[PDB]
């Protein structure tokens, strides 16, 4: 009866707490998509701020892990911030230990291993978040690596996360400077979700060769205007 309350095996060989963490990843009802250009990686995340008392510049599910790595999280923001702090510490520690910046895939494996530990030890619950790491690796180029509560991670050509991740995923499959990549991603998210975006409805992160950065509301409005033309 308690196989559903701690991460031990069920008689069917399943970890119900991990599956429920997967369920928790969609509580925020936010959809995100990541696309790689030939030179840059772009993450578009929905920015839903319904309360008018909120300061919108603080509502953010995109984190700058290091100079080159950015992370977009699908799930509750406390677990998202926990994962962000851990990833930042891991990146800084890798730089200290090995003399060079941690690659995006190494960090993704780092966090997936932590998730696996939470999956195997009973006193640790899984974090109910999905972590998408993006960077332009100095060896592998633009990179998307996505981690889930199960400790599973893999690299992606493009990826989408959220309640409507299926629609965006099939849309990208049908399709299959960084400003053009951003415009492509925004247009494709509009088409997949069937909803026009204002400058306040979107979060944009861009991983380039020298740095990862996030666009401001003014930059997002500029990209929306460019799409309008």
């Amino acid at each position: 009866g308690y196989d559903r309350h701690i991460t031990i095996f069920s008689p069917e060989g399943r970890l119900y707490q991990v599956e429920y963490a997967f369920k928790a990843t969609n509580q925020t009802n936010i959809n995100s998509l990541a696309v790689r250009g030939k030179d840059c990686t772009v993450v578009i995340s929905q920015k839903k701020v319904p309360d008018k008392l909120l300061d919108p510049t603080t509502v953010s599910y995109i984190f700058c892990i290091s100079r080159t790595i950015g992370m977009v999280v699908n799930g509750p923001i406390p677990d998202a911030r926990n994962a962000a702090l851990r990833a930042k510490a891991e990146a800084a520690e890798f730089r200290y230990k090995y003399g060079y910046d941690m690659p995006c895939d190494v960090l993704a494996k780092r966090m997936a291993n932590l998730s696996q530990i939470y999956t195997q030890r009973a006193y640790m619950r899984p974090l109910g978040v999905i972590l998408t790491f993006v960077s332009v690796d100095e060896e592998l180029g633009p990179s998307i690596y996505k981690t889930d509560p199960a400790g599973y991670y893999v690299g992606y050509k493009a990826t989408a996360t959220g309640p409507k991740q299926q629609e965006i995923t099939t849309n990208l499959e049908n399709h299959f400077s960084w400003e053009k990549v951003v415009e492509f991603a925004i247009t494709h998210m509009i088409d997949a979700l069937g909803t026009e975006f204002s400058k306040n409805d979107l979060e944009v992160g861009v991983a380039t060769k020298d740095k990862f950065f996030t666009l401001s509301a003014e930059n997002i409005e500029e990209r929306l205007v460019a799409i309008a033309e």
Partner: protein
């Protein structure tokens, strides 16, 4: 049967113990925060449970370092525990570095601490929601931190029993004053909002406590509103009821 332990996901992916802590918060007295053009104002309703309480002596609002004010609703001892952690954190930041801790950094530290209390079944979630903020080198910041560890920046924040009416009044404030409120008029309006929200708890008398941290009025340090300004705000609130 998923609500008996802290770190258990329900089949829907919910943590029911955090929701129960939120219920405990909702049971508490109403506390608000208003971000003015150059500072932050904190106001809290202090219920007078008995005539034997010493007036102006059971202080609820707490200072962290010299520039951060914290007010909370729900389980007051949990709020004091959180504020003790926040003071330790501000001291550690001011020892490793030299600047006073920035408000967003302090908010992140408190959020990490509160979120760590939802990770294990050997610990209980915080039974408070904390409105905190202050003035740093980047201006004024206002945050509300929930039992889940979630926190956001706010133009105006409210928790407690009369949180809905206080939120409506703060929304009216944000609508009517896009230019940015002034610290003194913010104190007056905080008094007004607390008095308005007390109507949901009219069965008992209450004492109004206000504090503020303004770049101009208080020189960027958190100070309690006392004396002439406090009485002026009280009279403004009393008049604004009628």
């Amino acid at each position: 049967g998923y609500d008996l332990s802290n770190s258990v996901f329900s089949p829907d992916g919910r943590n029911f113990q955090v929701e129960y802590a939120v219920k405990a918060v909702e049971n508490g007295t109403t506390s608000i925060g208003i971000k003015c053009n150059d500072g932050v104002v904190f106001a809290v309703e202090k219920l007078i449970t008995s005539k034997l309480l010493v007036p102006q002596k059971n202080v609820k609002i707490q200072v962290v370092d010299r520039h951060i004010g914290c007010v909370y609703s729900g389980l007051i001892p949990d709020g004091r525990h959180l504020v003790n952690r926040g003071r330790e954190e501000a001291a550690s930041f001011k020892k490793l570095y030299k600047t006073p801790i920035p408000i967003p950094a302090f908010a992140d530290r408190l959020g990490q601490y509160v979120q760590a209390h939802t990770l294990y079944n050997s610990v209980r979630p915080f039974g408070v929601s904390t409105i905190f903020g202050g003035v740093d080198k980047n201006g004024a910041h206002l945050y509300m931190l929930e039992p889940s560890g979630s926190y956001w920046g706010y133009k105006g924040a409210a928790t407690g029993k009369g949180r809905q009416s206080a939120k409506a009044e703060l929304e009216k404030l944000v609508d009517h004053h896009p230019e940015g409120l002034s610290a003194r008029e913010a104190v007056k309006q905080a008094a007004k909002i607390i008095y308005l929200a007390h109507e949901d708890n009219k069965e008992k008398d209450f004492e109004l406590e206000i504090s503020w941290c303004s770049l101009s009025e208080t020189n960027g340090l958190h100070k309690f509103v006392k004396g002439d300004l406090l009485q002026e705000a009280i009279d403004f609130a009393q008049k604004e009821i009628n």
